[PDB]
Design a protein around this ligand. Structure first.
Ligand SMILES: Nc1ncnc2c1ncn2[C@@H]1O[C@H](CSCC[C@H](N)C(=O)O)[C@@H](O)[C@H]1O
Ligand SMILES: Nc1ncnc2c1ncn2[C@@H]1O[C@H](CSCC[C@H](N)C(=O)O)[C@@H](O)[C@H]1O
Ligand code: MET
Lengths: 258, 280, 281
């Protein structure tokens, strides 16, 4: 089914590819950030979810995502029950009740390193305290706190830029009650006009305390990930160059609780 | 509905707490107060809220002594429902207190936090002297703050509140938790302190209160110059108000300014009671 | 009995003796050479013991070791193979999931500086008393690991890996006691907070005053006494050092760095204690 996914958006594609590997067959799925519903359409038509629910921060997409679903997978669009309203993460009673019933919570959420291209406009400071905000995933840690409390037996499947390393993405889950599994990964290319200052800032400042530290971000010179390079190095070609071609992993990780 | 007399209209922080406590619905519940202090809150929960049973503790072990006396003199017909745990108790960190918390339906508290009236410590002291008359002329004494500095929400001055939420979730996972906050950092943060720690927040009640004159707000000004990376920028504006009604808003700097020009200007902020319900 | 050349492990083993593991099933993170495994088996009388180590070979070396040190028992020692950081393999979680007590003496700012060197030597000694007669693969090339634990709140006092462990045990074995060895330079309240912050009630099982080797850098602890709180407003933080072997004469990190300046070689002691975390039952 290499026709279902579309290579237009590599982030979205690796998400859907992991969603498939996830094994959503006959499950109740909640999607945080349904956006336009395509992932819902995909999870209903290709992965065969028994029921899909979800929400979005934007009060209007929930309704629009019902159309696309009705149009893109008409025969299964009666298993889609969005939760309407401006729902940040899962913070309304209905969302919690729906999340409380799901087997799998899935999403691809804001995180430093996402393509700027997003929003594209046709939720930040309260998350700043989170320990894993230090590497840009505060919002993702915020969801895991809620999921472990609201549905402690549900899987959680999330999409990540992997510039910060796989050991740390895994630690985001281990720190919050889940054992992670990488379901799918892909090397993508980032636009040429994209700012990675935050990642070179990572490998330069010191540890929690004034303590010694070695750390390098995972970047790639080629679209195959053959040659590696640190945040400081990939910024070189983009200093002596202007359109150099930089790559980084994007991956989908499942967190499965005890 | 509780008449308009039981609420302390002399200290608005306590008044907000008490109006909150009555909306919380403590009738018939077993309550545990972190920091019983003088016990006037206990008197209120027994006499006005109809608590079936109120327990609690305090860091200074003399208090619970005098708390009984005040309860007895304010709620004589219900004083037999008040069983505090004796001894110096920090948060709930003693076996007796953990045993009491584990049996309570609701844990309530108006804990130390950055932004509280700067005269709160001094008031407490004085009361120690007095009241502790029956002491025959007589530690930490104040929740140290070193050990609660690791907590993430200590970044907004709520580390001790967070330490409690970490304790209540482990020891009384079904219990509601009702806490008093100054709301300078805004309700998004206050709610997130609960969501981050296992609780669904609900704001029970809130008031615009006047901050004493000459109160330091530099910590809150410092929060707005929200330092970049990692990462990175953030617009963060604290919530202050110029008029009691709270119609005119200001930020920590816009307020640190109002005072700059005219010392004595009037600066208001919100105090609110939030309940955490475990998604249980 | 114990070794006098290694206080941390003397106090750690003592602790184990006080924890009352008679009858229990235990899991040790960082089994190393197997000396605590034998110590629990033979002195503590544990029902059965399991454990793992980051170094993937130690597990093989350990079973042998035990067999020689705990020949009678030792049938009750089932290690888990593989390079196991903390408890992060399905087999490890399986074994942790069914233990009554997880125990560990784990890397941490303020551990002895020569601790990596003692382990190399201890591995070298043991894989000779069992063969050997090899080269220098008795050797953690790890480095690897430390960065993923940088986000943990208690890593600001150098206990990040220890916190990272508690998050795992709480989820994997919510009813299990967790017994851990710490240098108490940052103070007993901070150590207690580490458990209390992560769903455990702490208890100090045993504590010893130990000598700091001279030469040990302690600028990190003096740095605690100077930087401000997360506020960041002023803070009052004093580390717990001592001037004497009995912990009579208290002393903070800054003044302890005074001495060393002055004398360049003064004794300097601090506390090592075993704390059990027990979760609400
Ligand atoms: N705090 C929040 N809670 C719920 N949904 C959110 C949210 N913040 C953003 N969203 C929604 O999440 C959707 C995707 S935003 C994440 C895009 C991702 N970086 C990628 O490359 O694919 C958007 O529709 C947005 O409305
Ligand atoms: N991340 C990790 N996961 C599991 N075991 C680890 C580990 N890091 C180190 N270890 C193990 O811990 C042991 C030595 S660390 C011991 C130092 C201790 N502070 C003391 O002074 O006594 C070795 O067996 C080592 O391989
Ligand atoms: C055995 S790894 C030890 C390193 C330790 N975390 C330190 O920085 O002191």
């Amino acid at each position: 089914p290499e026709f279902a996914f579309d290579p237009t958006d590599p982030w979205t594609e690796t998400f859907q590819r992991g969603l498939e590997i996830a094994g959503l067959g006959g499950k109740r799925v909640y999607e945080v950030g349904i956006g336009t519903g395509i992932n819902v359409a995909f999870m209903l038509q290709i992965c065969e979810a028994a029921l899909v629910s979800g929400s979005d921060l934007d009060p209007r997409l929930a309704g629009l995502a019902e159309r696309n679903v009705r149009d893109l997978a008409p025969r299964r669009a009666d298993r889609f029950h969005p939760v309407e309203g401006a729902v940040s993460l899962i913070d309304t009673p209905e969302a919690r009740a729906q999340v409380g019933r799901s087997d799998v919570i899935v999403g691809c959420l804001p995180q430093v390193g996402e393509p700027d291209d997003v929003r594209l406009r046709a939720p930040w400071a309260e998350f700043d305290s989170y320990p894993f905000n230090s590497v840009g995933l505060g919002l993702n840690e915020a969801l895991l706190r809620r999921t472990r409390a609201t549905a402690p037996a549900a899987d959680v499947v999330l999409n990540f830029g992997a510039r910060v390393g796989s050991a740390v993405l895994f630690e985001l889950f281990e720190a919050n009650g889940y054992v992670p599994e990488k379901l799918h990964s892909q090397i993508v290319l980032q636009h040429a006009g994209t700012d990675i200052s935050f990642f070179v800032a990572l490998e330069n400042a010191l540890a929690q305390t004034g303590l010694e530290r070695e750390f390098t971000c995972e970047f790639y010179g080629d679209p195959e990930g053959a040659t590696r390079l640190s945040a400081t190095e990939a910024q070189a070609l983009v200093d002596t160059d202007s359109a150099a071609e930089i790559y980084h992993e994007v991956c989908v990780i499942r967190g499965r609780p005890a």
